[PDB]
Write a protein that binds this ligand. Structure first.
Ligand SMILES: COc1ccc(S(=O)(=O)N2Cc3cc(C#N)ccc3N(Cc3cncn3C)C[C@H]2Cc2ccc(OS(=O)(=O)C(F)(F)F)cc2)cc1
Ligand SMILES: CC(C)=CCC/C(C)=C/CC/C(C)=C/COP(=O)(O)OP(=O)(O)O
Ligand SMILES: [Zn+2]
Lengths: 406, 317
């Protein structure tokens, strides 16, 4: 009768608090701060003398999202060059919560992204803005989430491929936009839109796998460009691009596995983006989404020691972190408690929650759903972070046409 | 930049007589918008007029001053940065005052990507890195882990070959915060691009340094990751004293990182056909078990799997 179901609330969990060896630095001071704050969230139940249960506040989240899909206050002025991102974050959050898109909203998004599309290929952050690979990725994913004939046909595939060739560099890399610079995220953006819309030529990604491979460092993770610190956003993008390119093998997967698994925080349960930095809800996707990707990679090499039920991270603790610490009572999700909500964190907290809930490897399916059973989300594809159905459906539809040049 | 956006006397561009000849260009969001931002009057006014000058490709001093305001209102707008760079060149603006400008904006918005990119274009144009290491060091003084700052520093050092004083800098910062993973990465960046890690006097200095840091702060994971990082390419079992010296730390320094490093040595021992196979594998399994079960349970699924991997390939079999 004295058995706590929530991993974060068990008495032995208090041992997982930071040991600072009596040597204080900014890093340890800051980590201790978060941990005090998180402990007080975990302890809330005992202190108020109530039994815990974890509820994903689906209705609050839904109203936050359905409203933002139409209209945003002057607080999102800082995202006026990222409007397709907002479409993608919001539509993906709605697809994870299993909310259909009124056919008319679908068509309004379509018409809007049409206005964002550049005549020379790709999409910009808003109507009449120059194109850029990030909003191009977001626009494509949003259109695939909608997944109607209308949506698919907004995309000008010929121009898209030209645009991608315009950004392609000698050393394997891609510019994020014309007159811009390169990082691993742009290669991922290019691989995602290229593979989904079927425009991969034999020479498009020549050198790209090796360029990405140069970004893996002494830590095992991947930095934004060669020589830079390993970081979860770039590491996710690096490995997922290589999965699309079928060059998973270009990396040392063993150092990569060891690095990402180390990024789960023993106390908080969430993931940090870099070693010795703070926990953050969005890495619930960037970091935890690496696990399904490494599973498919290592399994395809014949790793006989892989689990048939679980990803190689504490799925339970990640769910406890998101549900207890990352929900805004007004709707939306968060980096951490005391941060303010936004649509990016709403998208990636939900994306990460879904990954923590659904294991899949061959015929082996196994869910783990903390809290009430209605907490269960729709699954998401670990490479594209849209629904596995939207992915299969899109690839199938665009395989109907030839790679431009055929 | 003649009239500041936060001036009490700031006036909308639509109320400025020196703009009376040009008609603003409203954003076209369509008959029924999605993700429609309800901009402030100030923001919309600037961007209506920015759309007008961009549309006409007006390469004028007034346009240049306008980009400033549009950037200040949304410094992530890469379209406006591109146009500002077209103007810098068309108007043959003094790039040194433009460096003074980017310095001030980066101080204010250090985590914005576009501002750092803009600075790199100017350094490239000027072919002059003379202010960079000191500027970057000021940013890092406010946030020692700023990713863009570290990237710009790496770029500057590499492109202009300015390696000579970097290791001193790293040692300053490592002393300020020995848990700063960005600095451990910088240390590695410098050494691998200068002396390298094969010079045996250097590899030993580095390993002695790290162990010395690990001893003062045993739960600092960055040092463990460095140590592991600088020894593992060659193979941990190539260094037979290493096992012994870590086992000696265990009594009074046993973090789960020490234990996990012990396991890494054992795996390399077993992979290089060491003495006592049936055995070393067992000692490591004891350790994996202790980790999955007791010392590092957040990673239970990882440590389980290492166990299963080591079993499947190193038992009597
Ligand atoms: C409000 O402060 C911001 C700071 C940074 C940005 S960002 O545009 O440079 N970008 C996305 C981002 C959006 C929001 C919102 N709403 C909030 C944060 C945020 N960040 C900063 C952040 C998130 N969590 C902790 N932090 C410090 C991340 C940033 C970078 C980014 C851009 C595209 C990304 O998508 S992607 O990897 O799939 C790509 F490949 F397409 F790029 C992912 C990350 C935006 C706002
Ligand atoms: C991309 C980028 C600058 C990531 C680090 O941001 P950040 O340092 O603000 O995020 P993080 O500290 O969680 O890595
Ligand atoms: Zn975040």
């Amino acid at each position: 009768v004295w058995s706590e179901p929530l991993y974060s609330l068990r008495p032995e969990h208090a041992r997982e608090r930071l040991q600072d060896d009596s040597v204080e630095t900014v890093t340890s001071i800051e980590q201790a701060k978060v941990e005090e704050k998180i402990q007080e969230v975990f302890s809330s139940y005992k202190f108020n003398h109530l039994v815990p249960r974890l509820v994903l506040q689906r209705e609050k989240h839904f109203h936050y999202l359905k409203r933002g899909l139409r209209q945003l206050t002057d607080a999102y002025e800082c995202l006026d060059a990222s409007r397709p991102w907002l479409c993608y974050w919001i539509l993906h959050s709605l697809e994870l919560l299993d909310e259909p898109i009124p056919q008319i909203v679908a068509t309004d998004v379509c018409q809007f992204l049409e206005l964002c599309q550049s005549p020379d290929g790709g999409f910009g952050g808003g109507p009449g803005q120059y194109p850029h690979l990030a909003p191009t990725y977001a626009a494509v994913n949003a259109l695939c989430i909608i997944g109607t004939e209308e949506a698919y046909n907004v995309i000008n595939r010929e121009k898209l491929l030209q645009y991608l060739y315009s950004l392609k560099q000698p050393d394997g890399s891609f510019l994020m936009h014309v007159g811009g610079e390169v990082d691993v995220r742009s290669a991922y953006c290019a691989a995602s839109v290229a593979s989904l819309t079927n425009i991969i030529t034999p020479d498009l990604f020549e050198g790209t796998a090796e360029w990405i491979a140069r970004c893996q460092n002494w830590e095992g993770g991947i930095g934004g460009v060669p020589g830079m610190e390993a970081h979860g956003g770039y590491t996710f993008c690096g490995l997922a691009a290589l999965v699309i390119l079928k060059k998973e093998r270009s990396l040392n997967l063993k150092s990569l596995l060891q690095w990402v698994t180390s990024r789960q925080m023993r106390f908080e349960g969430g993931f940090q983006g870099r070693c010795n930095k703070l926990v953050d809800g969005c890495y619930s996707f960037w970091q935890a989404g690496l696990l399904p990707l490494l599973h498919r990679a290592l399994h395809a090499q014949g790793d006989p020691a892989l689990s048939m039920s679980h990803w190689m991270f504490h799925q339970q603790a990640l769910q406890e972190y998101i549900l207890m610490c990352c929900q805004c009572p007004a709707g939306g999700l968060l980096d951490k408690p005391g941060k303010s909500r936004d649509f990016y964190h709403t998208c990636y907290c939900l994306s990460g929650l879904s990954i923590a809930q659904h294991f899949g490897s061959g015929a082996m399916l196994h869910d783990v759903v903390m809290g009430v059973p209605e907490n269960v989300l729709q699954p998401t594809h670990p490479v594209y972070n849209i629904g596995p159905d939207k992915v299969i459906q899109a690839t199938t539809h665009f395989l109907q046409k030839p790679v431009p040049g055929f | 930049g003649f009239l500041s956006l936060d001036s009490p006397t700031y006036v909308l561009y639509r109320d400025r007589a020196e703009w009376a000849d040009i008609d603003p260009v409203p954003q076209n969001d369509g008959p029924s918008p999605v993700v429609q931002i309800i901009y402030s009057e100030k923001f919309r006014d600037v961007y209506d007029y920015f759309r007008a000058v961009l549309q006409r490709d007006e390469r004028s001093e007034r346009a240049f001053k306008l980009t400033r305001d549009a950037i200040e209102l949304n410094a992530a707008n890469y379209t406006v940065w591109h146009f500002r760079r077209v103007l810098l060149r068309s108007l043959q603006k003094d790039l040194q005052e433009e460096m003074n400008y980017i310095i001030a904006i980066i101080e204010e918005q250090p985590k914005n990507y576009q501002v750092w990119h803009h600075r790199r274009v100017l350094v490239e144009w000027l072919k002059d890195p003379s202010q960079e290491l000191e500027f970057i060091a000021d940013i890092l003084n406010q946030d020692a882990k700023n990713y863009h700052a570290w990237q710009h520093r790496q770029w500057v050092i590499q492109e202009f070959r300015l390696w000579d004083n970097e290791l001193q800098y790293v040692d300053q910062l490592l002393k300020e915060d020995v848990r700063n993973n960005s600095v451990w990465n910088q240390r590695h960046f410098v050494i691998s691009n200068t002396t390298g890690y094969s010079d045996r006097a250097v590899l030993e200095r580095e390993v002695q340094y790290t162990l010395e840091m690990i001893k003062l702060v045993p739960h600092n994971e960055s040092a463990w990751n460095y140590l592991k990082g600088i020894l593992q390419d060659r193979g941990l079992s190539r260094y037979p004293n290493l096992l012994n010296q870590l086992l000696d730390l265990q009594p009074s320094h046993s973090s789960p990182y020490l234990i996990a490093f012990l396991v890494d040595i054992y795996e390399d021992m077993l992979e290089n056909q060491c003495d006592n196979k049936e055995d070393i594998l067992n000692k490591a399994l004891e350790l994996c078990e202790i980790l999955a079960k007791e010392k590092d349970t957040i990673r239970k699924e990882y440590w389980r799997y290492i166990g299963r991997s080591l079993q499947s390939k190193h038992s009597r079999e």
